[PDB]
Paper text:
The UNC-45 chaperone controls myosin function mediating the folding, assembly, and degradation of the muscle protein. In addition to functioning as a folding factor of the myosin motor, UNC-45 can form linear protein chains that provide regular spaced docking sites for HSP70 and HSP90.
Given the difficulties in obtaining a co-crystal structure with C. elegans UNC-45, we moved to the less complex fungal orthologue SHE4. Despite lacking the TPR-domain, SHE4 contains a functional UCS-domain for myosin binding. Isothermal titration calorimetry (ITC) measurements showed that 13 residues (561–573) comprise the core of the myosin motif, binding to SHE4KL with a KD of 0.6 μM. After intense co-crystallization trials with various myosin peptides, we obtained a well-diffracting SHE4 co-crystal with a peptide comprising Myo4 residues 561–581. We determined the co-crystal structure at a resolution of 2.4 Å and were able to visualize a minimal SHE4:Myo4 complex in atomic detail. In this structure, the Myo4 residues Lys561-Phe562-Ile563-Val564-Ser565-His566-Tyr567 were well-defined by electron density. The eight myosin residues are accommodated in the UCS-canyon by a dense network of hydrogen bonds and hydrophobic interactions. The tight binding mode forces the Myo4 peptide to adopt a bent conformation, with its C-terminal portion being directed out of the central groove of the UCS-domain. ITC-measurements showed that binding to the myosin peptide was abrogated in the N475A mutant, confirming its participation in substrate binding.
Residue numbers in the entry:
A (entry chain B): 74 to 80
B (entry chain A): 1 to 224, 230 to 309, 335 to 640, 644 to 665
Amino acid sequence: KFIVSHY
Amino acid sequence: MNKVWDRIVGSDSADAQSVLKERCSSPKDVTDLLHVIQNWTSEIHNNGEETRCWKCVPMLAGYVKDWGQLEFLCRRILLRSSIQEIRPLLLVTMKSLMSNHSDNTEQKCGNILQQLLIEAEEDSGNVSLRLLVDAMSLVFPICLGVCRDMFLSTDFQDILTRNLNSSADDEHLVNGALRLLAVSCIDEAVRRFIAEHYLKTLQQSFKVEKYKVLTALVLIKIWSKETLNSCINLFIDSLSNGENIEINTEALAYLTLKPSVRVLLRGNGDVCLKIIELIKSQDTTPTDLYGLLIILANVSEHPSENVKDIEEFNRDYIIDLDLIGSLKSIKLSTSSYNQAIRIIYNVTRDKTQISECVKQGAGLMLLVFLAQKRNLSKDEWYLLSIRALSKTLIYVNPETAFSKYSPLSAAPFLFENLPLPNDNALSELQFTQLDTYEALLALTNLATINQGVDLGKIILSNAQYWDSIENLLLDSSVRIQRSTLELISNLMSNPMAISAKFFCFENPKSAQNFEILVKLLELHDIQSQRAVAAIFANIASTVPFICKELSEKRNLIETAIRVFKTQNTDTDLRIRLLVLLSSIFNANAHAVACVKNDEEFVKELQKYRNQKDPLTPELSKEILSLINLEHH
C-alpha cells in the first residue's frame, strides 16, 4: 500500500 | 655439457628450467656449462638465441657462489647493452648477480665502464660512445656507485657533451643519451648536475621533434611554470598523435595527480578522443591500457578545478563516447578493473549520468567486481564499488539496473555498509555515516520489489541482516533513522519478512519493539513519522489477525489520534493515520466507543469531509459513521 521510493 | 646448451638456445621448443635435470651434476653444470657460456657469449648471436641464453643464465648465475665462475658475465652483458631487444633480459641477468657477489660485480662493472670510456675516446666513430651510455643506462639503477662516479667524471662529461654538440643529427646517439639522463635521475647527486649543466642542451633538443618526448621526460625528473607546461603540453600533444605511447602514458599518469595538469588535459579535446580510442582499441598493450585508465580516472574524479567542467568532460568523453559500455568486452587485470570501478564511481557522482551508466552495463561491472573480491580483498576498492552501487540503486529503478539479472544480488554488499551488531562490528570496510545512509536508501528501493518479499527472503536467510536494521531503529542520525524506518515500512507490505519482529506480542523482544515503534510516531522528523505510520497502516490494512491485536493496543490508538489532532495538515502523515485508524476502528467497536466523545478528534475529522487526496474525505467519513454507530 504505502511505498517509499527514491528513484 | 655443450649439447645441453645448444638445446637451451637452439629453439623455443625447449624449457631451460626443465634442462636443469640434464644439469644434474653440480660441477659439470657449475663448470663446463659456465665455460661453454663463456666461449659461446664471446660472439654476438641472433636475437632468438641471445634471448634464450639470457633467460636461462640468471637461473644458473643465482645458484653459483664462486665469483671466479661468473666474473666473465659482466663483460658479456655490458657489451650487449646496445641490443635493445634483450636489454630487460640483460638487466635481470645482472640483478641475478646482485644477490651474491654484489660487491665484486659492481667493481667488475666499473672496470669495464672505465675501459669502455677509453675506447670511446679513441674511436673516430660514435658507436663506442653509444655503447658506453647504453651500458650506463642499463645498469645504473643497480650499480649506482660506479655509474655515478663515471657520469660525474669530467672525462665522461667531456666526450658526451662534445658529441651532443657535433653530432646533433645522430638520433641514436642523442636518444640513447637522453635515456641515460632520465634513468640516471634515480640518483640525487646526478639529478643536481643535470639540472645545473644540461638545461641548455635540453632546451635545444626540445626543438627537434624526434628528441622532444625524451627531453620532456628528463625535464620532468630534473624539476627541483611554462617549463612544466611546455613539457606536459608535449606529452598531451604526442599522445594525441598516437606515438611514444608507453612513455607519455606513464608520464601523464603521474602528472594527472596535479589539478593544473588535469585542467590542461581536459581542455585538449584531441587527446581525450585519443585516450578513449586507445582504451577501446584491441591493439594497445595491457601496460598502456592501465596507464590510460589511470589518467582517465584521475581526470574524471570529482574534487572534494571546477565541478561542472569535470561533469562536462565525463558526459562528453566517457558517457558520450561509450567508454563504460566498451569496458565490458575488454580484458582487464585486477589493477585496471580497479581503475574501471574508479571511473564508474567518478561518473556516478553526477546523478544525471547514472541512467546512462546503467544502460552501458555499469551495474553488472560493479556486481561482478564485488563477487570476485567477496572472499578475497574487502579493500578500499571493494568499498568504492559499494559506494558506486549504492548511488546507482538510489536513482534508477532496480529491476533495470543489472541486465535483467535480479537487483537483489546487490543486497548483501549494501548490508556490508551497515553497522553490524556492536558485539561483532570491526568491519574491514571503513564505511562512513553517509555510506550507511546511502546503503539504506538503496535497500529501501530494493524493498519496493514485489511488496518487499524478495528482499525479505534475504533478510530472513541471515539473522545478521535483520539485527543490523534493528540496530539503526534509534540511531543518533536523523537521516539514518528515517531511512531505516522507510526501509521497514516497505518490508511491511508482506508480513512474511519481519512482521514477527514487531507484532508477535507473545515474544517479549517483539513486544518491546512494538512499544518503541509506537513511541516513534511522535519523532520530530516528519519523514520518519510518515514511515512509522506507514509501518502500522501497511500491516493493519493487510493482515486481519495483526489488525485485530493492534486494535486492542491502547497506546498505539492514543498516540495515532494525538498525532492526528496536531499534524493532520501533513497530507502523507494524515492519510497514513486515517488508514490505520479506520482499519482499527472497523475491527473493534469498543475502540470506537472509547473515542466517541472526543470532541477535538471528531471536529478534526469533520473538517476533512470536504489535492490529489481522495482517501482523506472517504476515510474521515467512514470513521465518523462508525462513531455515529456508537451514538445512535
